[PDB]
Design a protein around this ligand. Structure first.
Ligand SMILES: OC[C@H]1O[C@@H](O[C@H]2[C@H](O)[C@@H](O)[C@H](O[C@H]3[C@H](O)[C@@H](O)[C@H](O[C@@H]4[C@@H](O)[C@H](O[C@H]5[C@H](O)[C@@H](O)[C@H](O[C@H]6[C@H](O)[C@@H](O)[C@H](O[C@@H]7[C@@H](O)[C@H](O)O[C@H](CO)[C@H]7O)O[C@@H]6CO)O[C@@H]5CO)O[C@H](CO)[C@H]4O)O[C@@H]3CO)O[C@@H]2CO)[C@H](O)[C@@H](O)[C@@H]1O
Ligand SMILES: [Mg+2]
Length: 519
């Protein structure tokens, strides 16, 4: 059933426990948002190339999510009484394919998943440039073929079948991809962006049309059954951890310092310092929050520089009154804190029912701001006002979707009028926009990495510059793509050879993707 296929594809987006490892291992290190967890530091933190780890997106999407949606799109393409489910499938196929190409570059798309349908195996790799062409034509046509008088969409965990919102999402995705190609093809970028604003339905203009995959409140399990269970947010499960006491989600200094040093209200909504001596083995219950105690006693937060483990360098701790008091009736507790002074990801982001973020109004505000700085014709609102509106929506996103404490007007105004302020020069504005997007995209690591590479903001430095150069087996520079699966070079040989021929025979994670014009 086409509608059922949509449900599963959507669940499989953040629900696949197997695939979400790639984000913990590589992405969150490359974006320098998490660091210290063994998996994050070893792989992305110290540029350890592992083909199995790098091919998780490819394998997962081409064997499950995208394969299914391609099949469902195909069976509904020629049926005028199924134009809504068809259009929706086409929009989601674009979204899922965007994650593939923004990871690896050239990939099967046009010929993808046509094994049993057309008897066409060994699909060719479409050029990234052509994939992006296809994204604009597919989203434009999907938007124009939507018709609320036709079929009802019954399996949709994002908008519950509201096809008007799917129009808004499609046109917002056009905005995203327009701005992605804004360095490599400036004129096309501008046209596509302007066309998207003018299209039927418009774009996502406030949070009520944010594209969030709803996930279920379900227990974290790492047993075998869990790897075919997509009902819960598996990225959140992983950031809690298979090894949650030894290897939780410690924040990277780049991200923590950005928040802390800018007086960002979200510093201690996103991160806290926890003692986990009594923490549950399979959920983030019974953690001792020591953040306020550390501030009162004047204890230095010690976030992990890129390349550092939680244990290297070993931090300076203190003796906790809170933990000493808790030790009286809980004798297993110790009062001496060590790695607890290293900020960790807040409990709010460690829930199975955390949404799977596809795209937000906050991002749209930022794309619009950047468009206005580039002097595109995108309306009457000032860049600054758009920027201000995006930062606000990005702060409020945490309140509305993760039950974080509300940020007051006065708190927001203090931040935005000081170190959160918009730039004056073009470069300062682009920096501010894309640094702020960086923070927003923390729960959308696919998009977070794509935009850091594309925008060049924030300016990140190699782990080498933090004293970890001796461990970098895969080279100095932060990888800007992932290499193709060995499976592909083995069993899709002709198509693979054709693809690597276009990169001078290389298949290297330091080769810039077509939309990424500089390191
Ligand atoms: O000096 C002053 C003070 O010192 C104090 O002592 C300190 C000391 O100073 C420190 O140096 C020391 O540091 C220790 C630290 O305590 C240890 O925790 C650390 O241990 C790491 C260890 O975590 C790590 O383990 C990982 C394994 O290596 C991996 O193989 C394993 O991989 C997992 C993976 O995590 C998981 O995701 C994966 O899932 C599979 C999926 O991929 C697949 O798709 O599906 C299948 C099922 O279908 C899944 O299984 O599975 C794999 C398993 O195959 O992850 C492990 C982590 O989760 O290994 C590292 C090296 O191998 C270890 O180092 O080591 C540090 C040292 O290096 O700590 C002490 C304190 O104890 C003094 O006490 C003070 O007095 C002094 O003042
Ligand atoms: Mg770049």
């Amino acid at each position: 059933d086409p509608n059922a296929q949509l449900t599963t594809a959507q669940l499989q987006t953040y629900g696949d426990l197997s695939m979400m490892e790639i984000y913990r291992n590589y992405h969150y290190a490359f974006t320098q948002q998490l660091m210290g967890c063994w998996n994050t530091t070893n792989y992305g933190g110290r540029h350890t190339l592992d083909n199995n780890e790098m091919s998780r997106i490819w394998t997962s999407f081409y064997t499950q999510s995208l394969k299914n949606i391609i099949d469902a799109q195909y069976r509904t393409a020629e049926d005028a009484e199924k134009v809504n489910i068809n259009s929706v499938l086409r929009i989601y196929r674009v979204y899922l394919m965007s994650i593939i190409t923004d990871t690896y570059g050239d990939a099967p798309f046009s010929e993808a998943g046509l094994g049993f349908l057309e008897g066409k195996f060994n699909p060719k790799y479409d050029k990234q440039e052509d994939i992006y062409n296809a994204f604009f034509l597919e989203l434009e046509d999907a938007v124009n073929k939507i018709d609320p008088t036709k079929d009802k969409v019954t399996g949709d965990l994002i908008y519950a079948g509201d096809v008007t919102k799917w129009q808004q999402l499609a046109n917002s995705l056009r905005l995203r991809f327009a701005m992605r190609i804004s360095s490599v093809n400036p004129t096309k970028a501008q046209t596509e962006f302007e066309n998207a604003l003018a299209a039927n339905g418009g774009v996502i203009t406030d949070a009520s049309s944010d594209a969030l995959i709803k996930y279920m409140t379900i227990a974290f399990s790492f047993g075998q059954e869990a790897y075919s269970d997509y009902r819960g947010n598996s990225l959140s499960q992983l950031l809690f951890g298979n090894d949650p006491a030894n290897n939780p989600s410690y924040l990277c200094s780049t991200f923590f310092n950005q928040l802390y040093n800018s007086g960002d209200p979200r510093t201690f909504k996103i991160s806290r310092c926890y003692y986990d001596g009594l923490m549950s083995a399979t959920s983030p219950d019974n953690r001792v929050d020591i953040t306020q105690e550390m501030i009162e006693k004047g204890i230095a937060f010690s976030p992990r520089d890129p390349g550092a483990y939680s244990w290297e360098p070993w931090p300076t701790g203190y003796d906790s009154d809170i933990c000493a008091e808790l030790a009286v009736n809980n004798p297993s507790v110790t009062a001496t804190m060590a790695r607890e002074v290293e900020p960790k990801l807040a409990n709010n982001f460690l829930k199975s029912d955390n949404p799977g973020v596809v795209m937000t109004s906050a991002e749209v505000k930022f794309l619009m701001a950047e468009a206005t700085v580039k002097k595109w014709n995108v309306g009457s609102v000032s860049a600054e006002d758009l920027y201000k509106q995006g930062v606000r929506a990005a702060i409020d996103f945490l309140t509305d979707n993760y039950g974080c404490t509300a940020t007051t007007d006065a708190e927001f105004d203090a931040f935005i009028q000081d170190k959160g302020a918009f730039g004056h020069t073009d470069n300062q504005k682009l920096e501010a926009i894309n640094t702020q997007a960086w923070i927003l995209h923390f729960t959308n690591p696919a998009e977070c990495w794509a935009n850091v590479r594309r925008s060049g903001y924030p300016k990140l430095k190699s782990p080498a510059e933090y004293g970890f150069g001796q461990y970098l087996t895969g080279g100095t520079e932060i990888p800007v793509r992932l290499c193709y699966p060995v499976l592909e070079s083995s069993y899709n040989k002709k198509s693979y050879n054709e693809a690597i021929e276009r990169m001078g025979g290389t298949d290297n994670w330091h080769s810039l993707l077509w939309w990424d014009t500089e390191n």
